[PDB]
Amino acid sequence: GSTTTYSSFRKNYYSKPWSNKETDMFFLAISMVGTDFSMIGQLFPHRARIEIKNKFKREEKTNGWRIDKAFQEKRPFDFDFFAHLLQKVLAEEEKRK
Amino acid sequence: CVLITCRQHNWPLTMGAICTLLYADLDVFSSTYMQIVKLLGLDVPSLCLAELVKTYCSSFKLFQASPSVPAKYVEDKEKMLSRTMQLVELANETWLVTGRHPLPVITAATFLAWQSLQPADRLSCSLARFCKLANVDLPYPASSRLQELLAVLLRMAEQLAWLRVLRLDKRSVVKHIGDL
Amino acid sequence: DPVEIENRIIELCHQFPHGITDQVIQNEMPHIEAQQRAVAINRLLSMGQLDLLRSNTGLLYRIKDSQNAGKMKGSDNQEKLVYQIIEDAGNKGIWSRDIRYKSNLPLTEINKILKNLESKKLIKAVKSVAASKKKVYMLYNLQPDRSVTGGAWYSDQDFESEFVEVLNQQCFKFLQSKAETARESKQNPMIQRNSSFASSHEVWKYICELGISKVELSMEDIETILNTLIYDGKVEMTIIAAKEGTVGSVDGHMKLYRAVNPIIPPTGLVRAPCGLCPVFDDCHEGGEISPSNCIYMTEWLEF
DNA sequence: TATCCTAACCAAAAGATGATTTGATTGAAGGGCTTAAAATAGGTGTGACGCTCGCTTCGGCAG
DNA sequence: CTGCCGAAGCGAGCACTACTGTCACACCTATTTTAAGCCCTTCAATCAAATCATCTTTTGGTTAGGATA
Ligand code: SF4
């Protein structure tokens, strides 16, 4: 309780960084699912739709070529296999580390 | 409306000091504030730099002895406010004021002025260590302003040979601002 | 030990649907004194384990439902207490404003209480005659009172004026029709004393046979509709034995109606414009409103 | 001798000099959002309205 | 057995609460580009205090450098 109180822009709160393997899953999802950010938010329960849109906005700055290359390398779609691939690869990443 | 009223009387008042009582938030109240002003198109001054410092500097507890501040921390207010003027005038002409939150400038200047008045006594202190004595919560940009201003003052320091000879740096430059 | 007393009371109440006297507690175990069991009962009433049934064989006690005792624990002590106020009100109910005003319980908790009691199918909110949109809270299983339902005439917080007015005009239509047809017999006034009158059951059967209103026309309702005509100066009343009609709407008796002629023609006074004049007090020969100036009279010259 | 003063200097107190380990501060990023513009779109919920002449009350005997 | 008129008592004008429902539209979804500023972790990059290893001066004290008593 004091009149010195600071006010500044807190809307940039600390969000969880993105993993390289998580990025690899993101690309195989563009290969596998498409650009339906709501659907991708469902395949990644740890990421919400706005996180997917921000991820796309960051990727498009340099990696448009990889976006297209993944999008043309199409794969049949299965949510269940997708979830298993995620947690297995994450567990493998932790075990390697 | 109360805010613009005070601005008409060039009466110093800051943004959060109002929002303190109103359950508001920066974006909510700032966006709305713009809305009425553009709606009414009334002429209103800006916050003039020197006005806010008088009330801000006077709020510190450095002017009397207390169990939290023995005398070595105590200081004369007139000297401090003068020194802060002689620093803030540099800040504006060196482009540092424009386009930034104004208050961090004041905090940085006051911290260093207070140190430089008794550097042998006060070089050992820090941002938060200083502020919590005055029960002041500090800007995080104040670190940015501090690094900026030390960078400036060393560049002044080299201009004088009888300052150049001492090979001044971050640690030592503080105790010569009275000279500069 | 009250701990023994409470458990015994609930168990005995489980096996006795008629209720248990306080003596039953001691009959099952003799060491229970009257004072301590009365003390236990006086707070079991405020805990929902017990409801008191006054009777000649001493006061009797009974339990209602598992959730009845459940919604007395902690802050829920106010819930079934509000239900106690409502079940005292029975089919009449109590407004939101009144429950706050009467019990002084916090309205914020009364909201939760209302929603939970409605969910449990215990109380329901109904709009009332007395204050229109002021909803009474009243027992879910019971039909609400006339002060809440307002009969067939009360509809959507308004009053079907056309419905009652058409009833009035049609019932006198038949009353005067029956009176004139009876007098057309023109044999003997002594038999006209009976023939001219109409039975309330008879006219109710006729008017419900017409079926003007899709809403039901009740016996006492039609009788009260007829009761407006006498005070309209239109009909007469006569009471006979109960054997008339299917109802016999009076204890050992039954009452009839008959259209009535007006005793005198319109008077001369009502033909005078001054009689109808509203500024009568202010009209003076000296006043600015005068018979030498009055417009009502000048205009009354023409037609 | 029986022992201390004190060169040389061992043995340790104690004094103290330096490189390193351990403990702490911090750059810059992650990434995140704001002023301002363009527009169509829909919902559903919020919240305007100090006496003292006059006057009062009920018993006690006449008639 | 009604009732007129007595004695005890009080008084005032002068004192240079609300709905409540409709309604209309604020509010939101939902994207693009600017610019600098502001923003929290978070480790990487960097810096600072205390400690361990060891040398050196003095207190103890001897050998041997030295001495009175
Ligand atoms: S205004 Fe004419 S009608 Fe009315 S009271 Fe006077 S005279 Fe009679």
In terms of Cα–Cα distance, which of C154, C148, C165, C145 is closest to C225? C165
Q: How many angstroms is the resolution?
A: 3.8
Q: Buried b / exposed e across C221-236, counting CB within 10 Å, b at 16+? A: bbbebbeebeeeebbe
Residue B52 structure tokens: 């806010």
In terms of Cα–Cα distance, which of B75, B6, B82, B83 is closest to B45? B6
Reported as half-sphere exposure (CB side, CA atoms, 13 A), residue B68 has a value of 12
Report the C-alpha gap between C75 and B132 in whole angstroms: 45
CB atoms closer than 10 angstroms to residue A4: 19
- Burial class of residue C76 in the structure, from the number of CB atoms within 10 Å of its CB (0-12 exposed, 13-18 middle, 19+ buried): middle
**Residue A42 identity (one-letter amino acid):** Q
Distances (CA, A) of C23 to B4, B90, C5, C12: 81, 98, 12, 11
Report the C-alpha gap between C196 and C80 in whole angstroms: 59
Minimal Cα distance from A6: which residue of B?
B139
Reduced DSSP (H G I as helix, E B as strand, rest coil) percent helix, strand, coil of chain C, to 5: 50, 15, 40
Distances (CA, A) of C109 to A33, A44, C86, C300: 50, 42, 16, 68
Reduced DSSP (H G I as helix, E B as strand, rest coil) percent helix, strand, coil of chain A, to 5: 60, 0, 40
A6 touches strand D (CB under 7 A): no
H-run or E-run covering B39: helix B26-40
Reported as half-sphere exposure (CB side, CA atoms, 13 A), residue C269 has a value of 1
Residues 6+ apart with CB under 8 A from A2: B135, B136, B137
CB atoms closer than 10 angstroms to residue C273: 15
Let me know the angle formed at the C-alpha of B29 by B26 and B34, rounded to the nearest 5 degrees.
115
Report the C-alpha gap between C116 and C86 in whole angstroms: 14
* Length of chain C in terms of residues written: 303
In terms of Cα–Cα distance, which of C7, C57, C50 is closest to C29? C7
Report the C-alpha gap between C125 and C139 in whole angstroms: 9
CATH of C2-63, one of 1.10.10.10, 1.10.3720.10, 1.20.140.10, 3.30.420.40: 1.10.10.10
Let me know the angle formed at the C-alpha of B54 by B48 and B59, rounded to the nearest 5 degrees.
135
What residue has token string 């168990």? C11
Kindly state the greatest CA–CA separation across chain C.
Answer: 103
In terms of Cα–Cα distance, which of C58, A6, C126 is closest to B103? A6
User: Does the CA dihedral B159-B161-B167-B168 come out positive or negative?
Assistant: negative
Quick one: DSSP state of residue C202?
Answer: H
Shortest distance, CA B71 to any CA of chain A (angstroms): 24
Report the C-alpha gap between C224 and C200 in whole angstroms: 10
Let me know the angle formed at the C-alpha of B171 by B170 and B173, rounded to the nearest 5 degrees.
70
Let me know the angle formed at the C-alpha of C223 by C221 and C226, rounded to the nearest 5 degrees.
115
Q: Which nucleotide is nearest to B27 (CA to C1')?
A: D34
Reported as half-sphere exposure (CB side, CA atoms, 13 A), residue C96 has a value of 17
Report the C-alpha gap between B166 and B161 in whole angstroms: 9
Residues of C forming the annotated binding site for [4Fe-4S] cluster?
274, 277, 283, 294
Instruction: Provide the H-helix boundaries in chain C.
Output: 2-15, 22-28, 34-44, 66-70, 79-89, 96-103, 107-119, 146-149, 161-183, 189-195, 200-210, 219-231, 273-276, 295-300
* Strand pairing category for C253-259 and C198-199: antiparallel
Q: Distance (Å) from CA B121 to C1' D22?
A: 28
**Residue B125 identity (one-letter amino acid):** C
In chain B, which residues are last before a break of more than 2.5 Å from C to the next N? none
What residue has token string 């991820």? A55
Quick one: DSSP state of residue C45?
Answer: T
Do A25 and A93 contact (CB within 8 A), yes or no?
no
Report the C-alpha gap between C85 and C93 in whole angstroms: 9
In chain A, which residues are last before a break of more than 2.5 Å from C to the next N? none
Q: What residues does C126 pair with on adjacent strands?
A: C136
Residue A11 structure tokens: 């809307």
Report the C-alpha gap between C227 and C257 in whole angstroms: 9
Reduced DSSP (H G I as helix, E B as strand, rest coil) percent helix, strand, coil of chain B, to 5: 60, 0, 40
Shortest distance, CA B153 to any CA of chain A (angstroms): 27
In terms of Cα–Cα distance, which of B109, B79, B81, B114 is closest to B94? B109
Kindly give the distance from the C-alpha atom of residue C277 to the centroid of ligand 1, in angstroms, as a whole number: 6
Residue B95 structure tokens: 């482009």
Backbone φ, ψ for residue C48 (5° rounding): 85, -5
Distances (CA, A) of B75 to B65, B156, B176: 9, 26, 18
Q: Distance (Å) from CA A69 to C1' D10?
A: 82
Report the C-alpha gap between B61 and B59 in whole angstroms: 7
Do C201 and C264 contact (CB within 8 A), yes or no?
no
Do C147 and C129 contact (CB within 8 A), yes or no?
yes
Chain B residues near residue A3 by CB distance under 8 angstroms: 17, 20, 59
In terms of Cα–Cα distance, which of C238, C162, C160 is closest to C200? C238
Q: What residues does C154 pair with on adjacent strands?
A: C159
Q: Which experimental approach was used here?
A: cryo-EM
Across the beta sheet with C51-53, what order do the strands follow?
Answer: C20-21, C60-62, C51-53
Report the C-alpha gap between B95 and B86 in whole angstroms: 15
Return the C-alpha torsion angle C260, C261, C263, C268, nearest 10. 140
CB atoms closer than 10 angstroms to residue C186: 8
